[PDB]
Design a protein around this motif. Structure first.
Motif, PDB file in Angstrom:
ATOM      1  N   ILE A 155      65.097 -43.347 -75.717  1.00 51.55           N
ATOM      2  CA  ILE A 155      65.028 -42.129 -74.927  1.00 51.55           C
ATOM      3  C   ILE A 155      66.124 -42.179 -73.856  1.00 51.55           C
ATOM      4  CG2 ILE A 155      63.609 -40.637 -73.440  1.00 51.55           C
ATOM      5  CD1 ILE A 155      62.610 -40.647 -76.386  1.00 51.55           C
ATOM      6  N   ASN A 156      66.829 -41.065 -73.650  1.00 55.98           N
ATOM      7  CA  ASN A 156      67.840 -41.014 -72.597  1.00 55.98           C
ATOM      8  C   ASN A 156      67.230 -40.525 -71.271  1.00 55.98           C
ATOM      9  OD1 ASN A 156      69.982 -40.617 -70.893  1.00 55.98           O
ATOM     10  ND2 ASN A 156      71.256 -39.456 -72.317  1.00 55.98           N
ATOM     11  N   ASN A 157      66.860 -41.437 -70.373  1.00 56.15           N
ATOM     12  CA  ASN A 157      66.191 -41.027 -69.124  1.00 56.15           C
ATOM     13  C   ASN A 157      67.035 -39.988 -68.367  1.00 56.15           C
ATOM     14  OD1 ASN A 157      64.339 -43.151 -69.673  1.00 56.15           O
ATOM     15  ND2 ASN A 157      65.467 -44.592 -68.384  1.00 56.15           N
ATOM     16  N   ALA A 158      68.339 -40.090 -68.514  1.00 53.94           N
ATOM     17  CA  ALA A 158      69.210 -39.312 -67.653  1.00 53.94           C
ATOM     18  C   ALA A 158      69.535 -37.947 -68.272  1.00 53.94           C
ATOM     19  CB  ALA A 158      70.467 -40.099 -67.333  1.00 53.94           C
ATOM     20  N   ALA A 159      68.794 -37.564 -69.312  1.00 53.16           N
ATOM     21  CA  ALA A 159      69.037 -36.292 -69.981  1.00 53.16           C
ATOM     22  C   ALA A 159      67.922 -35.272 -69.717  1.00 53.16           C
ATOM     23  CB  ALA A 159      69.242 -36.506 -71.504  1.00 53.16           C
ATOM     24  N   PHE A 160      67.039 -35.557 -68.760  1.00 54.70           N
ATOM     25  CA  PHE A 160      65.920 -34.658 -68.471  1.00 54.70           C
ATOM     26  C   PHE A 160      66.122 -33.993 -67.115  1.00 54.70           C
ATOM     27  CE2 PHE A 160      63.198 -35.452 -72.019  1.00 54.70           C
ATOM     28  CZ  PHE A 160      63.562 -36.709 -72.453  1.00 54.70           C
ATOM     29  N   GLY A 161      65.703 -32.741 -67.007  1.00 53.82           N
ATOM     30  CA  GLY A 161      65.797 -32.014 -65.753  1.00 53.82           C
ATOM     31  C   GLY A 161      64.470 -31.360 -65.417  1.00 53.82           C
ATOM     32  N   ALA A 162      64.121 -31.353 -64.137  1.00 52.54           N
ATOM     33  CA  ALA A 162      62.918 -30.669 -63.681  1.00 52.54           C
ATOM     34  C   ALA A 162      62.916 -30.575 -62.161  1.00 52.54           C
ATOM     35  CB  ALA A 162      61.681 -31.421 -64.160  1.00 52.54           C
ATOM     36  N   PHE A 163      62.258 -29.555 -61.627  1.00 44.75           N
ATOM     37  CA  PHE A 163      62.057 -29.463 -60.189  1.00 44.75           C
ATOM     38  C   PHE A 163      60.742 -30.091 -59.769  1.00 44.75           C
ATOM     39  CE2 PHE A 163      64.585 -25.346 -60.573  1.00 44.75           C
ATOM     40  CZ  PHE A 163      65.771 -26.033 -60.444  1.00 44.75           C
ATOM     41  N   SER A 164      59.922 -30.475 -60.736  1.00 38.57           N
ATOM     42  CA  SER A 164      58.612 -31.025 -60.416  1.00 38.57           C
ATOM     43  C   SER A 164      58.266 -32.258 -61.258  1.00 38.57           C
ATOM     44  CB  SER A 164      57.526 -29.947 -60.567  1.00 38.57           C
ATOM     45  OG  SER A 164      57.380 -29.531 -61.922  1.00 38.57           O
ATOM     46  N   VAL A 165      57.406 -33.103 -60.704  1.00 37.72           N
ATOM     47  CA  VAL A 165      56.922 -34.274 -61.407  1.00 37.72           C
ATOM     48  C   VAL A 165      56.267 -33.827 -62.695  1.00 37.72           C
ATOM     49  CG1 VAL A 165      55.139 -36.044 -61.442  1.00 37.72           C
ATOM     50  CG2 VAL A 165      56.571 -35.736 -59.433  1.00 37.72           C
ATOM     51  N   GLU A 166      55.511 -32.744 -62.589  1.00 40.67           N
ATOM     52  CA  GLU A 166      54.712 -32.221 -63.696  1.00 40.67           C
ATOM     53  C   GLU A 166      55.564 -31.708 -64.870  1.00 40.67           C
ATOM     54  OE1 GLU A 166      52.807 -28.638 -62.704  1.00 40.67           O
ATOM     55  OE2 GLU A 166      51.542 -28.531 -64.500  1.00 40.67           O
ATOM     56  N   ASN A 167      56.661 -31.007 -64.581  1.00 41.37           N
ATOM     57  CA  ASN A 167      57.572 -30.600 -65.657  1.00 41.37           C
ATOM     58  C   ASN A 167      58.372 -31.776 -66.195  1.00 41.37           C
ATOM     59  OD1 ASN A 167      56.651 -28.047 -65.290  1.00 41.37           O
ATOM     60  ND2 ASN A 167      58.499 -27.239 -64.329  1.00 41.37           N
ATOM     61  N   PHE A 168      58.813 -32.663 -65.301  1.00 37.28           N
ATOM     62  CA  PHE A 168      59.545 -33.843 -65.755  1.00 37.28           C
ATOM     63  C   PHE A 168      58.690 -34.655 -66.721  1.00 37.28           C
ATOM     64  CE2 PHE A 168      63.107 -36.766 -65.473  1.00 37.28           C
ATOM     65  CZ  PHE A 168      62.558 -37.932 -65.976  1.00 37.28           C
ATOM     66  N   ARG A 169      57.465 -34.954 -66.315  1.00 31.53           N
ATOM     67  CA  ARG A 169      56.536 -35.721 -67.139  1.00 31.53           C
ATOM     68  C   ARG A 169      56.270 -35.059 -68.500  1.00 31.53           C
ATOM     69  NH1 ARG A 169      52.120 -35.969 -63.656  1.00 31.53           N
ATOM     70  NH2 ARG A 169      51.276 -33.984 -64.392  1.00 31.53           N
ATOM     71  N   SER A 170      56.007 -33.759 -68.476  1.00 30.33           N
ATOM     72  CA  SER A 170      55.723 -33.023 -69.702  1.00 30.33           C
ATOM     73  C   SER A 170      56.917 -33.013 -70.655  1.00 30.33           C
ATOM     74  CB  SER A 170      55.320 -31.580 -69.394  1.00 30.33           C
ATOM     75  OG  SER A 170      54.142 -31.543 -68.615  1.00 30.33           O
ATOM     76  N   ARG A 171      58.113 -32.841 -70.107  1.00 31.02           N
ATOM     77  CA  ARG A 171      59.291 -32.781 -70.962  1.00 31.02           C
ATOM     78  C   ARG A 171      59.624 -34.133 -71.560  1.00 31.02           C
ATOM     79  NH1 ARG A 171      62.309 -28.650 -66.745  1.00 31.02           N
ATOM     80  NH2 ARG A 171      60.766 -26.993 -67.106  1.00 31.02           N
ATOM     81  N   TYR A 172      59.474 -35.195 -70.772  1.00 32.82           N
ATOM     82  CA  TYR A 172      59.720 -36.549 -71.259  1.00 32.82           C
ATOM     83  C   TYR A 172      58.739 -36.887 -72.390  1.00 32.82           C
ATOM     84  CZ  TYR A 172      61.448 -41.372 -70.802  1.00 32.82           C
ATOM     85  OH  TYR A 172      62.019 -42.595 -71.013  1.00 32.82           O
TER      86      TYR A 172
END
Length: 182
Positions: A155-172
């Motif tokens: 998984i590329n940690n540095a390829a995710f974007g979000a303004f919130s913990v909740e969106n970041f977590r869900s997208r990952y």
């Protein structure tokens, strides 16, 4: 939503593998504050497992923590040990010496001083330290946290974007879920 195939693949890999360090802030976040590890466990297919391996390269106690984690794995105590070492380091800032490592392990598990001292250097723990260091090389690990799916996708940690913990977590987790499909 990004990831790269590793070469060569790892055969007989757990469905999810995460290399981490007790010194790694984003690892602390994944495990303890953002619920990313938990969101990942939540999409594990039936029968599949997530396994975590500690990396030695980072920090003064790198190798001692890896061996302590090897002991946790042998004893099936990774859950309490993980919480205990992140609290001790990241939160309380009292992980400076090898005695600290043993003290936190004993407090989290109730193991005795004498059993820790005999066990920490047992063949079975020796084997588990070997395994962690072996797999570090096979997976081609470059840093932490490094999450691998079915022994083939990093998984590329540095390829995710979000303004919130909740969106970041869900997208990952969504990406890990996708890669576990089949």
């Amino acid at each position: 939503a990004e990831w790269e195939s590793i070469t060569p693949p790892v055969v007989d890999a757990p469905a999810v593998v995460e290399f981490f360090s007790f010194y790694c802030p984003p690892c602390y976040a994944f495990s303890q504050t953002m619920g990313v590890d938990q969101a990942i466990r939540h999409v594990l297919p039936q029968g599949s497992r997530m396994v975590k391996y500690h990396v030695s390269l980072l920090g003064p106690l790198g190798h001692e923590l890896t061996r302590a984690w090897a002991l946790a794995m042998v004893m099936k105590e990774t859950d309490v040990i993980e919480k205990a070492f992140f609290t001790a380091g990241m939160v309380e800032k009292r992980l400076h010496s090898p005695d600290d490592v043993r003290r936190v392990f004993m407090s989290a598990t109730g193991i005795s001083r004498g059993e820790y001292d005999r066990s920490i250097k047992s063949p079975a723990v020796n084997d588990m330290v070997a395994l962690q260091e072996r797999l570090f090389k096979e997976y081609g690990v470059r840093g932490t946290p490094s999450v691998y799916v079915r022994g083939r996708y990093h998984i590329n940690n540095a390829a995710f974007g979000a303004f919130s913990v909740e969106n970041f977590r869900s997208r990952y987790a969504a990406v890990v879920r996708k890669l576990l499909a089949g």
